[model samples]
Target: STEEEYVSPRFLVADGFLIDLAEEKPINPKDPRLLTLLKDHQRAMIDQMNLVKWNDFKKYQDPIPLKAKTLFKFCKQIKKKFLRGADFKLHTLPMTVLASCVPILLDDQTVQYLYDD
Candidate 1:
């Protein structure tokens, strides 16, 4: 089965940290400063979620999974921001690998299509 319209996914902000509702663990736990930065970024990301057409090369699952490449890029961008903006050490930021189960980007959105059955 395929998803027709993209629905807004749920998020959890626990203990002043933002986390995926499905995954209770913090997205960036290695660095508390980065974690706090991401938590705030997540909040800002959600409100500005704009839908974009799904890439034919990408899979459109019901829960809406983010591509590994996309996730990696996200991590890289964040790390760069942390270094430049927050004045953080690169060594403190741990390398991220693909985790079990699909990961969703807090700011990700998809286009909703109308179909006649």
Candidate 2:
């Protein structure tokens, strides 16, 4: 992978298994429309997070724990699951919804493991 296009948005979104992010199609890295699509999708996710009241946390009161163990690995697993034609909504899902669905339970400890690795 050459450095020039290795980290390109097209490469990341298409080859890196993140095609469920946005509604745009027929891509090109040099196109300004794609850039806007990226930003638009990003803000939409943030909006969803806000709409779901993501940060107002209470341990027992909340429906699920606000923690995740091996978060990156979990995400990779989900990505692979999607790539395998698993049945799931093929669109942007808020981070909080994803966490709540899994009922993740590891926060600082997860961060600590990151440093340890």
Candidate 3:
């Protein structure tokens, strides 16, 4: 006759991976138009910078005034084009909705990380 092998119940213990408490809910990659607003803001800033670079501040006696005027015009254009009508606000409802759907052309790692994370 063969003897039967016996085994005891074994228990395993683990520290377990840390879970982000705030990460309970899945992030909506396309939410409240935050992405769109950020993109528009970035584009506006870039355009403003390009305008300054093109103007060549060193050549002007008072580059400050010229730069200020350029910035004003840029703001006006952004408002006219991207943000038109009384209902259109930077971080508001319809604007946010529209921004979420609109694709961002700029490839900013920082912004991408923020959205992704």
Candidate 4:
């Protein structure tokens, strides 16, 4: 978990393992590594994604500058493209959703940065 915490968000989410986050082992659910007030947004996003078709992984993704507009744009693009592919059943639901998690959790710069490594 400790090592995974520093991994790129793409891997973290694509791996499909949100942190187990025992009620308060790291900190109470009410208080998180992200922040206090935005805790609402983070928890909600995490919860929503939790029920999605993904494998299990645990570790908090450290915060970086994830631009809202940019993040949503990639999500929209990925969703549209994948949905189109979904029509042909070219990709399994798990595969489509799992792959989409990558861009949704990362931006272009981060993507390139990852590949650079």
Candidate 5:
């Protein structure tokens, strides 16, 4: 089943350095301090999220804050529930292949949707 709207998913930030998503980048293109690319990428996701996905997103907040490590592991448990999990790319989460986190932006409404649902 498909949802009426899809949101750029939000994630719970762990206890660490604050990632200010709204911060502007330096003018120099060669500058390693270029956060514009990262910001713009987030902007597109936020735009799509704001236009149609906000409602969907609002309903997804966890009642209590979840620790990042716990949620990460939970996504795994759910990811493996499907039979022949490795056979389908759709079932494979970015959490599986990439040594990374999904959302760069931290928010009040974070989720475990892939695993929770």
Candidate 6:
């Protein structure tokens, strides 16, 4: 179940934002600027996922069920963290999501590994 233990790429972003907000950084979750950033990051993540899926399906001929499942779980977690809070931790989700995107952008190996079986 190691694959099951892996968080989706997007949730990694969300978790990173949570850490930043917890550290007292000025992160406005509802701020249009922050929302825009979040939307862009989400779009990038999806694009990257699509690329990996294509590579796996075409080049490696692997069925990447885990990727889709992880993404779904991550989305649910984000909703719970941001939407269900009685006093929602407004800033955490955006900050964490932003932080999570850093590794994806900076680490070529991580990106490649997404399709590495």
Q: Cα lDDT for residue 91, model 3?
A: 31
* Model 5 clashing residue pairs (backbone): none
Worst 10 residues of 2 by lDDT: 108-117
On lDDT, who's better, 1 or 5?
Answer: 1
List the pairs of residues colliding in candidate 4. Answer: 17-57
Which ten-residue region of model 5 has the weakest summed lDDT? 11-20
Instruction: Report how far off residue 30 is in candidate 5 (Å).
Output: 34
What TM-score goes with each of the models? 0.19, 0.20, 0.14, 0.20, 0.19, 0.16
Clashing pairs in 3: none
Q: What is the lDDT of residue 87 in candidate 4?
A: 43
Model 1: lowest-lDDT 10 consecutive positions = 76-85
Q: After best superposition, candidate 4 residue 83: deviation in angstroms?
A: 42
Which should have the higher TM-score, number 1 or number 3?
1
Q: Candidate 2 residues 31-93, lDDT tens each?
A: 345455557665444333322221222232323222333323322222111111133222222
TM-score of 6: 0.16
What is the alpha-carbon lDDT of model 3 when measured against the actual structure?
Answer: 0.21
Superposed model 4: Cα runs more than 4 Å off = 1-12, 18-31, 35-38, 51-117
* Model 5 Cα shift for residue 70 (angstroms): 31
Tell how far residue 65 is off in model 5, in angstroms: 24
Residue 106 miss distance in model 1 (angstroms): 18
Tell me the tens digit of each residue's lDDT in model 4 across 12-115.
Answer: 22222332222211112222344533345555665554332211111213111222222222222222222215343323222332223322222112221000
Arrange candidates by lDDT, descending. Answer: 1, 5, 4, 2, 6, 3
Clashes of each: 0, 2, 0, 1, 0, 8
Which pairs of residues clash in candidate 2, taking residues 3 or more apart in a chain or in different chains?
Answer: 67-104, 68-106
Better of 4 and 6 by lDDT: 4
